[PDB]
Design a protein around this ligand. Structure first.
Ligand SMILES: C#Cc1c(F)ccc2cc(O)cc(-c3ncc4c(N5C[C@H]6CC[C@@H](C5)N6)nc(OC[C@@]56CCCN5C[C@H](F)C6)nc4c3F)c12
Ligand SMILES: Nc1nc2c(ncn2[C@@H]2O[C@H](COP(=O)(O)OP(=O)(O)O)[C@@H](O)[C@H]2O)c(=O)[nH]1
Ligand SMILES: [Mg+2]
Length: 168
């Protein structure tokens, strides 16, 4: 099965670092902050061979019709913030609403991802993120793209959310 996964959130939260951890199994310090691109990873998840096509979003904020239609083809979304950046957490509502807007649905597979969990300079409490994810009805996964903590869990959980959505 193929899955179109989309990684969204504010600049600097670690979308590209998370993506490259999944694709290449290491931490890329410098990934061009402006570049939006996609990558495939083939993996077996709960016994099913899965082709994950991951869109790592970036670039200028714009809402062209092409862009709405492209985002609408995403099947599941990682809502990424960084635990050291409160503005990135406050921006999660916006990304969730843009997904709901283009998919014309209140029920889109999503996972809330609190990245940079290796850093000591926390300004977003785990409880804040758990409360937000509970209010959205979605899982919350703590990650570090630096150490790889939680990375497979975030992507595989999103795949499991898509499978559950298909059966509703
Ligand atoms: C993603 C996505 C996205 C979706 F998931 C779903 C559907 C979408 C349909 C669209 O047509 C288009 C998008 C889409 N594309 C790019 C965005 C973006 N950029 C600028 C920077 C920060 C990330 C990256 C890309 N580089 N930024 C903000 O918002 C930033 C803030 C801060 C300044 C003002 N805005 C409004 C809020 F306050 C938050 N939204 C964006 C957005 F919705 C969509
Ligand atoms: N310590 C730490 N740094 C991170 C982590 N994820 C990303 N970074 C760093 O944060 C910056 C922004 O990461 P990037 O992947 O470009 O974020 P993007 O703009 O969301 O694609 C870079 O300096 C990364 O090396 C993480 O989990 N831990
Ligand atoms: Mg990036």
């Amino acid at each position: 099965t193929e899955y179109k996964l989309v990684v969204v959130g504010a600049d600097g939260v670690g979308k590209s670092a998370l993506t490259i951890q999944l694709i290449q199994n290491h931490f890329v310090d410098e990934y061009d902050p402006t570049i939006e691109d996609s990558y495939r990873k083939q993996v077996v998840i709960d016994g099913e061979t899965s082709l994950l096509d991951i869109l790592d979003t970036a670039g200028q904020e714009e809402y062209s019709a092409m862009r709405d239609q492209y985002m609408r083809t995403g099947e599941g979304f990682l809502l990424v913030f960084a635990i050291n950046n409160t503005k990135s957490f406050e921006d999660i509502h916006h990304y969730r609403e843009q997904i709901k807007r283009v998919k014309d649905s209140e029920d889109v597979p999503m996972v809330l991802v609190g990245n940079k969990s290796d850093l000591p300079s926390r300004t977003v409490d785990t409880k804040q993120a758990q409360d937000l994810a509970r209010s959205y009805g979605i899982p919350f996964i703590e990650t570090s793209a630096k150490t790889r903590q939680g990375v497979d869990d975030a992507f595989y959980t999103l795949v499991r959310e898509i499978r559950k959505h298909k059966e509703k």
